[PDB]
Amino acid sequence: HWGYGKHNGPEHWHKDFPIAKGERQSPVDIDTHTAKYDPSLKPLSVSYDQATSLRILNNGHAFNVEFDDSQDKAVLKGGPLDGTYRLIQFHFHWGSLDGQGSEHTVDKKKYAAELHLVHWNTKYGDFGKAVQQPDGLAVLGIFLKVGSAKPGLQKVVDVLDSIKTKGKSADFTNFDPRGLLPESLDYWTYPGSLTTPPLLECVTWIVLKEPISVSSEQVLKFRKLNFNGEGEPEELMVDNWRPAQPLKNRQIKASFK
Ligand SMILES: NS(=O)(=O)c1ccc(NC(=O)NCCO)cc1
Numbered sequence: 001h002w003g004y005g006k007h008n009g010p011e012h013w014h015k016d017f018p019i020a021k022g023e024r025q026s027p028v029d030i031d032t033h034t035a036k037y038d039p040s041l042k043p044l045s046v047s048y049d050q051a052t053s054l055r056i057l058n059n060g061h062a063f064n065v066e067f068d069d070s071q072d073k074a075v076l077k078g079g080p081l082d083g084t085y086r087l088i089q090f091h092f093h094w095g096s097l098d099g100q101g102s103e104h105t106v107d108k109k110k111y112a113a114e115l116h117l118v119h120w121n122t123k124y125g126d127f128g129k130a131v132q133q134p135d136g137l138a139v140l141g142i143f144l145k146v147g148s149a150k151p152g153l154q155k156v157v158d159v160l161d162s163i164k165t166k167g168k169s170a171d172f173t174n175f176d177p178r179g180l181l182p183e184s185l186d187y188w189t190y191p192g193s194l195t196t197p198p199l200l201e202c203v204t205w206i207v208l209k210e211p212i213s214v215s216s217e218q219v220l221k222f223r224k225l226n227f228n229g230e231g232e233p234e235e236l237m238v239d240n241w242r243p244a245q246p247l248k249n250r251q252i253k254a255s256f257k
């Protein structure tokens with residue numbers, strides 16, 4: 001099965017998922033001087049006031065905080081997007097060390113972690129249909145640097161002891177994802193893919209310029225999770241990030257000068 005180890009990590013994925021070598025793969029390096037400011041880009045509209053978180057799940061590759069996506073409760077609109085995209089889950093990718101962990105990079109800089117708020121285009125009815133479409137998903141990516149704690153992350157941090165191993169889930173209601181956002185919603189955008197198998201080329205990536213800061217203790221708690229199931233040999237869930245992929249025939253656009 002695919003993973004992030006020596007024998008099943010990102011360099012092996014193409015053997016089962018040949019789209020890994022496709023034309024619009026993610027993540028990418030964001031070369032900030034080559035990105036083009038597009039004044040026709042609209043501000044992002046993040047409407048999370050009615051969000052309903054339900055559960056948190058260790059899926060063996062990351063942990064997902066899942067939301068009720070059966071109504072337009074937490075939606076992303078505007079920016080480069082046409083129509084309305086519903087929040088289904090968020091998760092993170094992180095490193096074994098503060099010097100690495102993000103999937104996207106900025107002028108080759110790696111951040112300690114990267115948050116992905118995953119949304120699907122309501123015109124396609126559900127997530128499974130949306131991933132089959134070139135405009136099916138919008139993923140809002142937010143970098144994490146280590147410094148001051150992020151108070152809105154602590155509720156996530158504190159439940160991780162309950163989902164240490166693959167397949168464990170826990171109730172996780174009333175979590176407000178607005179507590180994970182930075183001040184500014186300035187962003188870069190480009191067409192790309194899921195960054196894990198099946199690597200489907202269905203994502204409008206929206207990557208925020210401003211990172212959030214989390215404490216060293218917060219990210220250390222991410223690194224105590226396990227990729228394995230309970231009663232299997234323990235392998236720490238760290239370095240669950242795919243490296244930057246070739247940009248190919250793509251231009252990254254910026255919402256800001
Ligand atoms: N990254 S990938 O192409 O999906 C892949 C799948 C299986 C493996 N190896 C495997 O299954 N070995 C048997 C031990 O469990 C390695 C990589």
Ligand SMILES: NS(=O)(=O)c1ccc(NC(=O)NCCO)cc1
Nearest residue numbers: 088089116118139193194195196
């Ligand atoms: N890292 S990423 O490109 O944001 C990503 C998002 C969703 C998936 N797959 C998925 O099934 N998401 C919804 C889970 O219920 C895989 C990769």
Ligand SMILES: [Zn+2]
Nearest residue numbers: 091093116195
């Ligand atoms: Zn992700």
